[PDB]
């Protein structure tokens, strides 16, 4: 269960002692950087976005792969080469999560052109995260995919603080109703409001990571959610009359 900051781990960490927590990939590239020089490392990628990065491409891709590449590469270049492209062609693309699961998805229009970069996915209302790329095609029920993500964040909540512990289950229940279209149109705006109530209000960043995929789904596919609600009454209002 995470501690509140302040205090900070470099001040009071493990056993009350100064402590730094760093990622495996952050730690592992340091000897090569020290031997080959900082000027060699900073010659890759844009300004303030230096170096190389491991990318994991999974999902509806012909050749899923863990591959190292220069940063600030486009998504379309990173997927068409090194991974064999989208299953069924690039025009069969529906959406892409560019940074794991905690960052919002992007539709096809943003993806064609955006660079896989820290200061480029953020301006596209997303984030680079861990640079784990998940690709969905036009056969995907994207509401069902984000619903399973909501189930994951409900399952992984540690339960310490009120908004995460109580609201991840609420988000999952609302998303499960939205998948079948058993909802109201204003419940979409309610869903956005509930994500805004969780986000920024918790102890750690898993609450933000639980709010963010639903925000991206609403923002880029609100028409799909509305059509799912409207067409469910073609199989629910025939019994009411």
């Amino acid at each position: 269960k995470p501690r509140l900051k302040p205090p900070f781990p470099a001040g009071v960490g493990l056993y009350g002692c100064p402590t730094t927590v760093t990622n495996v990939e952050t730690v592992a590239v340091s000897p090569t950087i020290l031997r080959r020089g900082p000027e060699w490392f900073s010659s890759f990628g844009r300004k303030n976005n230096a170096g190389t990065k491991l990318f994991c491409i999974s999902g509806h891709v012909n050749r899923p792969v863990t591959v190292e590449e220069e940063m600030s590469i486009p998504l379309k270049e990173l997927i068409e080469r090194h991974a064999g492209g989208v299953r069924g062609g690039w025009d069969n693309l529906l959406a892409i999560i560019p940074g794991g699961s905690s960052v919002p998805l992007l539709p096809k229009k943003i993806c064609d052109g955006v660079l896989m970069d820290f200061d480029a996915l953020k301006e596209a209302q997303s984030g680079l995260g861990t640079a784990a790329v998940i690709v969905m095609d036009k056969s995907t029920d994207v509401i069902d995919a984000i619903a399973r993500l909501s189930y994951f964040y409900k399952h992984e909540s540690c339960g310490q603080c009120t908004p995460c512990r109580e609201g991840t289950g609420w988000l999952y229940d609302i998303m499960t109703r939205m998948k079948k279209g058993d909802a109201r149109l204003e419940e979409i705006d309610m869903l956005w409001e509930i994500t805004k109530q969780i986000e920024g209000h918790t102890i750690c960043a898993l609450g933000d990571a639980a709010a963010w995929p639903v925000q991206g789904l609403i923002r880029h596919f609100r028409g799909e959610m509305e059509e799912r609600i409207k067409s469910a009454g073609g199989k629910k209002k025939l019994a009411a009359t």
Binding site: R184, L185, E186, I229, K230, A232, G233, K236, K237, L238, A239, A240
Partner: protein, 67 residues
């Protein structure tokens, strides 16, 4: 919560909830009277009274003569 009470199966919007209350009929109720709504001439009354009293006085004169 209000959707649980008034909503029906397959309702798409919260604006579609029915309302059935005490209401006037279409066209409203018909109009009603509000303000107050309302004898013989005194010449006629006095003439009838004079006729009856004159007959009485004639009968008095006749019975007086018979007595």
């Amino acid at each position: 919560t209000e959707v649980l009470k008034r909503g029906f199966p397959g309702m798409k919007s919260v604006k579609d909830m029915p309302i059935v209350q005490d209401a006037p009929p279409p066209g409203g109720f018909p109009t009603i009277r509000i303000e107050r709504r309302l004898g013989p001439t005194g010449v006629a009354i006095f003439a009838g009274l004079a006729a009856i009293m004159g007959y009485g006085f004639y009968k008095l004169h006749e019975q007086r003569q018979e007595k």
